[PDB]
């Protein structure tokens, strides 16, 4: 006879590239039974302007990998890596040359501009050269949507007709998952085969990889189709769970709480409507699950919010061939992933979740309705939304806009406010709690003021921050950005913002800029915006490898947290 | 075209047999979107003396299964099941007739006595008719051990010689996993394919299913080969984790702690010995892993205990063709799962773990060395063992035997005590912490008093309980049973006991009675012994489906805890 294992490279063990097989720009320095501590790793910049990547490695990590994890390598390169540690009280160091292979895009066709997604560095202020951004994007499969859930025949179907479809199985696309530095280089790749297989028909490996969120361990949760996962930066899949049997189509978000549970956004399969028809619902259930994959709690939004409220739905753009076209709801829209009222249609499209630990509640962004807080008791605590369409008793829960001095702000029922910078959010994403104790939201802005505008390019997106007084039931807009940047900063879908306390910036990713520009790449724009001065500290653009292909989100990742 | 799903059976949804596909004697009543509470299930006894199984079902369970779990069916039977609940304030009830299929043993050959293991009820005292016992046993594959880990060629191997084997991969056998009632009927079966596949050569489905232990959630953990698992009584696999890459060959035990971690017993692969030879060590490492499968801590026993101590090793029986044969240690014993001293041989054979929450330490049973407490700090706190062979400093940690009044008991270095019932344990199993605050042990008794006896049949096993004073470093024997039952109660290997506070009994399972009776089935004896009077409350024998085929363990299971 057989073949020897790799020999030791320096004063520890061998240096293994991509030990778990899912992360080709990582490596691992095998411990070979050495006992070490104070470990630190440095991956040197490539060329004169190369960004250096450096981090401490904790004991738990050394133990879990049986080795020193090496993160931050460049593809197809002779990476120069330094590892420093302590052993037998003595300070130790090795230098390695870690050759890597190439990043592969397994999903290409005649639409492909090239294999990888292009980056363009636009601005990097001094003090921000070190920043790393994980981009959660995707690439079309050659076949497109090839599978549907089978539904139940409705009262007025043809006698001869085959059964209809239900739910959202066709929301399925190959992942394109990478970390970019401030020189625009890929410094980490998640192999597309890690979770996905678009050529096989195993639904276990299908869906839309989304909701990449950090855990308290420096690892990450994600969802894809009918599973939810945890993985780490060495490409180790730490958890892979089937959704509990009652549920399906997990998309948009997963977030681990401080109680060791995970919040997910699913639909309910075999949901019995009042007319006795069974459907798979769309984006309108929330699960809390444990690490055993068991259900700790469920929020059925069809009994908490109002699936008949069409105030926003009726004001939406078709495109997100048919753009500018204000959505015309039909009472006979077949159940499915289709804009419409009622359980079985896309009436809510919930797309973010935040856990409020202070009172054991959840804050939801419903793209088609608003932002809402719902208690552990399944009651609505407040709503942030234009007042149109809300019946009693939910109307009583609408938050009242106010200025810095607390004085009511006048707004009409469509959300248009008088003599104020205050605006509500429309088709928003990522309603999250910031480290400052405030609510941050990416206000996409489709159907702004509950209508389409005169011309399509009359659309804008905002980063926005609110301060909420639950006791008084008032909301204050305390920070915004992007309304001036027009259509070149307009992300009709997806996207994210998050406040960064370390450098006092608002991090942002607009995921679908120029989505409608037929035949052009779609632009994902990573920003850091100085919170005090609104100065652009970072701006990096990522362009889709195929035209008119949305990006989903990005995260600002910190290597010093990755390997506790 | 298509086909409709099963229609609703009564006032909820359909009743699905073996919904997860791993547990043929379970069923599920689909909720079909009904909201219910106060759920209770009753499976009626078969015939006149049939045992009824009854249990409440918690909200978590209803949510996780999307239905009412039905546990405790008989095979190939028209089971009569009642389900009661509350809905819209109104008390509700259905009766169902739940047909089941047969239990299948997929591992049979010319040694098979018949397809299933035979049960023989020997004694059931009044008030114990309801007891259920999960039997963790196994059945030989037709090929036997077919795989080895590849090792490192040693200093003095032949020049032409192929590389040697290492570790314990051949420790591999098909599982036979069921619940028996007091009429000796099978009331649950875990499909052998759930974890095992002996006809394929995928090592992910190989090993020896063991260490089945209840969790705080009423589910169970287990180990097999290179994986560890959590499953529930509906046959759902809730977790499936690969061992961390530095480790292999998980056996004997797995226990979840109150901190949400799990203790496992493994060996270390590519363990570098002092002479520089790499081996996979055998049964001499403890991991604490989290539910992400990451290592939280490790105990390397080769640096904490003494792998050169042959006091007990040299006194052991071969058989466990060659029995009565006292073990003759050789200095040239090739590395492997072989009696021997040093890392890479089976010098310790650790077979149980208990967590001590009061001081964050672990208590281990080393078959070949004794019982030991090891602290979080990786130092030995105490040792319960005959004094022969222990060097300083470990000798100062031996516990000193004492009587009820606290006076020293005189024992020689082989453990034989003078004018006392007190004895140590030899080749013991399951050193666990009882609800009373004492240490319970199954004292198998091979190599008792560090020798073989005059005749093979002069061997006995005991259930034994100790009270330990860590401060004084004293140990007291406070209870025992079985020494008077002779050879028909002798289990040279495996086995377990556990104190049961509910009915004040000592539960026991002797796994290997008559192992050496060539050509006869091996007996596994389930016992509940009254703690006060030593009266046999329950005695049920299970006979192996092939001759000379040991059982492992059994657990007393409680349906009222299964479905929180
Ligand atoms: O077509 N998409 O890729 C798409 C559409 C909507 C969408 O929902 S959202 O909340 O992210 O806007 C996500 C992805
Ligand atoms: O031979 N066996 O299958 C076997 C032998 C020893 C053994 O170890 S013990 O700790 O469980 O006695 C387990 C199984």
JSON list of C-alpha atoms and ligand atoms in Angstrom, two decimals, chain B residues 140 171 173 208 210 252 283 320 349-351 367 427-429 444 492-495 515 550-552, ligand 2:
[
{"chain": "B", "resi": 140, "resn": "UNK", "atom": "CA", "xyz": [-23.84, -12.84, 13.87]},
{"chain": "B", "resi": 171, "resn": "UNK", "atom": "CA", "xyz": [-15.76, -5.43, 16.18]},
{"chain": "B", "resi": 173, "resn": "UNK", "atom": "CA", "xyz": [-22.14, -7.42, 14.20]},
{"chain": "B", "resi": 208, "resn": "UNK", "atom": "CA", "xyz": [-21.54, -2.78, 17.04]},
{"chain": "B", "resi": 210, "resn": "UNK", "atom": "CA", "xyz": [-24.23, -0.17, 21.76]},
{"chain": "B", "resi": 252, "resn": "UNK", "atom": "CA", "xyz": [-19.97, 0.36, 24.80]},
{"chain": "B", "resi": 283, "resn": "UNK", "atom": "CA", "xyz": [-11.02, 1.56, 24.03]},
{"chain": "B", "resi": 320, "resn": "UNK", "atom": "CA", "xyz": [-13.80, -13.97, 26.39]},
{"chain": "B", "resi": 349, "resn": "UNK", "atom": "CA", "xyz": [-11.17, -1.76, 27.70]},
{"chain": "B", "resi": 350, "resn": "UNK", "atom": "CA", "xyz": [-13.19, 1.07, 29.15]},
{"chain": "B", "resi": 351, "resn": "UNK", "atom": "CA", "xyz": [-16.90, 0.05, 28.98]},
{"chain": "B", "resi": 367, "resn": "UNK", "atom": "CA", "xyz": [-12.70, -3.78, 32.36]},
{"chain": "B", "resi": 427, "resn": "UNK", "atom": "CA", "xyz": [-13.82, -7.16, 34.64]},
{"chain": "B", "resi": 428, "resn": "UNK", "atom": "CA", "xyz": [-16.85, -5.07, 35.67]},
{"chain": "B", "resi": 429, "resn": "UNK", "atom": "CA", "xyz": [-19.44, -3.22, 33.56]},
{"chain": "B", "resi": 444, "resn": "UNK", "atom": "CA", "xyz": [-18.99, -9.77, 36.08]},
{"chain": "B", "resi": 492, "resn": "UNK", "atom": "CA", "xyz": [-18.32, -13.10, 32.08]},
{"chain": "B", "resi": 493, "resn": "UNK", "atom": "CA", "xyz": [-18.96, -10.05, 29.78]},
{"chain": "B", "resi": 494, "resn": "UNK", "atom": "CA", "xyz": [-21.36, -7.21, 29.07]},
{"chain": "B", "resi": 495, "resn": "UNK", "atom": "CA", "xyz": [-24.30, -6.80, 31.35]},
{"chain": "B", "resi": 515, "resn": "UNK", "atom": "CA", "xyz": [-21.64, -18.26, 26.82]},
{"chain": "B", "resi": 550, "resn": "UNK", "atom": "CA", "xyz": [-23.61, -12.70, 23.75]},
{"chain": "B", "resi": 551, "resn": "UNK", "atom": "CA", "xyz": [-26.21, -10.04, 24.42]},
{"chain": "B", "resi": 552, "resn": "UNK", "atom": "CA", "xyz": [-25.06, -6.60, 25.41]},
{"chain": "C", "resi": 2, "resn": "LIG", "atom": "O1", "xyz": [-17.42, -10.86, 22.43]},
{"chain": "C", "resi": 2, "resn": "LIG", "atom": "N1", "xyz": [-18.16, -9.86, 22.50]},
{"chain": "C", "resi": 2, "resn": "LIG", "atom": "O2", "xyz": [-19.19, -9.66, 21.55]},
{"chain": "C", "resi": 2, "resn": "LIG", "atom": "C1", "xyz": [-17.90, -8.90, 23.50]},
{"chain": "C", "resi": 2, "resn": "LIG", "atom": "C2", "xyz": [-16.78, -9.12, 24.32]},
{"chain": "C", "resi": 2, "resn": "LIG", "atom": "C3", "xyz": [-16.44, -8.23, 25.30]},
{"chain": "C", "resi": 2, "resn": "LIG", "atom": "C4", "xyz": [-17.26, -7.14, 25.45]},
{"chain": "C", "resi": 2, "resn": "LIG", "atom": "O3", "xyz": [-16.84, -6.27, 26.36]},
{"chain": "C", "resi": 2, "resn": "LIG", "atom": "S1", "xyz": [-17.66, -5.91, 27.63]},
{"chain": "C", "resi": 2, "resn": "LIG", "atom": "O4", "xyz": [-17.15, -4.76, 28.38]},
{"chain": "C", "resi": 2, "resn": "LIG", "atom": "O5", "xyz": [-18.97, -5.48, 27.21]},
{"chain": "C", "resi": 2, "resn": "LIG", "atom": "O6", "xyz": [-17.50, -7.21, 28.63]},
{"chain": "C", "resi": 2, "resn": "LIG", "atom": "C5", "xyz": [-18.37, -6.90, 24.63]},
{"chain": "C", "resi": 2, "resn": "LIG", "atom": "C6", "xyz": [-18.73, -7.80, 23.63]}
]
